[PDB]
């Protein structure tokens, strides 16, 4: 058949020794590096890591600890078991038979 020959591979560095590898046009190439570095590293990674570091008591594990401290204090001051085996009051349960 009639078909084009395979193109030869092109080295971005030959025309643009300063290439960042994003585009053959140097102005576009530089802009594309800047958005990736800014929106990728400066925003998402830096500010996103800061946002995660300061989440307000993620899934109440700090509240649970404070609440556990409040109950341990109360139960020991009143001679109660720290924890009971039964999760639910037996009086509210009607067993079969």
């Amino acid at each position: 058949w009639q078909e084009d020959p395979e193109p030869e591979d092109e080295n971005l560095y030959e025309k643009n020794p300063d290439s960042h590898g994003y585009d053959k046009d140097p102005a576009v190439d530089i802009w594309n590096m800047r958005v990736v570095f800014f929106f990728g590293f400066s925003i998402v990674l830096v500010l996103g890591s800061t946002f995660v570091a300061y989440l307000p008591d993620y899934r109440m594990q700090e509240w649970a600890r404070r609440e556990a401290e409040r109950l341990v204090k109360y139960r020991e001051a009143h001679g109660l078991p720290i924890m009971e085996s039964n999760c639910f009051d037996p009086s509210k349960i009607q067993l079969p038979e």
Partner: protein
């Protein structure tokens, strides 16, 4: 979820209405902004899930998978734009559109309350994924890879549809919040055995379960880089996410029905890890590595313990970044030497010193060095399966040894030794490539500082 659905949809007009030479800048920049806002999904509560509406919700399982999904889109754009540079403008925009449409289906899939809605979206991901592979793969057998990928999925997904519709008729609803309260035990009967298999086999194929895994290496060897990235990092986890949800309504039948799949997983992880020691295609080696890692996830889900579910969640996130990074590393070599043969280009640390460091870090996370979230997830599963049966520690420990062996074998073969004499086109690493590698590993390692956000609902 509309604050994520709509701006994702708007990426399409952005790409089509951009100046010809700005399509990668604009799509990449704005997809990164969507990824930033995805962190608002971290408003999770200890008791209740974050229930937006009648259609969508987000708990601690879906949130990390959503963030990973939206993080992966800009990375795929960065990874794709070089080998698509000669493509004509319309076909470039169509390629970006497939990636955007994949994100749209994925974030809806991970947040649907009702299981039929999850099913339709779960199935819809097939279309852009198949089109990405068969249209933009390089080799002849991408056509076969598409058919294997398409028909493995539908061989399992059609029974799932029948089971889902059957469950709604019996229970009255498939809203996942309703199922949590109206779930009833599954008694022993041949009918329930096939209901169980219909509810599970579709997700097993996706993971993929050992013995249903041969589509995966075929798919990876044919896919373009973006295809492998999304496939390895997110699409496999659709099956993991599906199993974690649907096992709710399969007790207590999972007690004995899990055995044959646990055996396949426990033995399969050793088999696939060993196979990696003899793989000659770098992409095929990474594909088999995924099978081995996902075998742990299947075991974790099936034994259904709080520790195993936490490990499964961490493993799914950790594997997604690690495996995606490895395909990107493998692809960076390929874009120079145009071959996936692992033994072709050796001693690359001499020629590309900083890319050798990325290879080193990706390998270290792949073999689960403490305290990477890769090890955290693996360790939690190993902890929990020991209680399930102490003898499992033998298979778990042996798999750790083999994983270290093939992970470092990859590193030694490609990066160390002598360089191949006749390969004289190993040009210095581009800024784009270095940024791409660092945009995988840095967030992965930063997650070590705060693992709790990837441990899932059982945390």
């Amino acid at each position: 979820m509309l604050k994520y659905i709509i701006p994702t949809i708007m990426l399409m007009p952005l790409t089509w209405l951009s100046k010809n030479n700005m399509i990668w800048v604009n799509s990449t920049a704005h997809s990164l902004l969507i990824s930033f806002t995805s962190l608002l999904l971290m408003n999770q509560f200890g008791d209740n899930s974050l229930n937006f509406s009648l259609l969508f919700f987000s708990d601690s399982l879906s949130t990390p998978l959503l963030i990973l999904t939206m993080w992966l889109l800009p990375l795929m754009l960065m990874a794709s734009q070089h080998h698509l540079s000669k493509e004509n403008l319309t076909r470039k925009k169509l390629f970006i559109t497939m990636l955007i449409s994949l994100q749209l289906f994925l974030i809806m899939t991970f947040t649907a309350m009702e299981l039929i809605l999850f099913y339709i979206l779960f199935e819809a991901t097939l279309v852009p994924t198949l089109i990405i592979i068969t249209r933009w793969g390089n080799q002849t057998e991408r056509l076969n890879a598409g058919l294997y990928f398409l028909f493995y999925t539908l061989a399992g997904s059609l029974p799932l549809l029948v089971a889902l519709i059957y469950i709604q008729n019996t229970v009255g609803s498939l809203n996942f919040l309703m199922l949590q309260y109206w779930v009833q035990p599954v008694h022993n009967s041949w009918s329930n055995v096939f209901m169980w298999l219909a509810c599970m086999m579709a997700f097993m194929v996706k993971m993929p379960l050992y013995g249903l895994h041969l589509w995966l290496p075929k798919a990876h060897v044919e896919a373009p880089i973006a295809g492998s990235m999304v496939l390895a990092a997110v699409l496999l986890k659709l099956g993991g996410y599906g199993m974690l949800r649907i096992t709710l309504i399969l007790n207590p039948m999972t007690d004995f029905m899990a055995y044959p799949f646990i055996m396949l997983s426990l033995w399969g992880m050793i088999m696939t890890s060993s196979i990696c020691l003899r793989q000659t295609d770098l992409k095929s080696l990474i594909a088999y590595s995924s099978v081995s890692h996902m075998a742990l996830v299947i075991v974790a889900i099936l034994i259904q313990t709080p520790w195993s579910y936490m490990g499964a969640t961490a493993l799914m996130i950790a594997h997604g970044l690690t495996s995606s990074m490895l395909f990107c590393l493998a692809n960076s070599n390929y874009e120079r030497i145009h071959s996936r043969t692992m033994i072709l280009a050796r001693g690359l640390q001499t020629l590309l010193p900083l890319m050798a460091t990325w290879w080193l870090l990706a390998s270290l996370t792949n073999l689960a060095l403490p305290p990477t979230i890769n090890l955290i997830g693996e360790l939690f599963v190993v902890m929990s399966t020991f209680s399930w049966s102490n003898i499992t520690i033998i298979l778990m420990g042996v798999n750790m040894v083999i994983t270290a062996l093939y992970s470092l074998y990859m590193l030694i073969m490609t990066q160390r030794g002598k360089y191949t004499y006749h390969i004289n086109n190993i040009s210095p690493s581009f800024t784009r490539e270095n940024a791409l590698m660092s945009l995988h590993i840095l967030p992965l390692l930063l997650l070590t500082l705060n693992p709790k956000i990837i441990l899932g609902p059982l945390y």
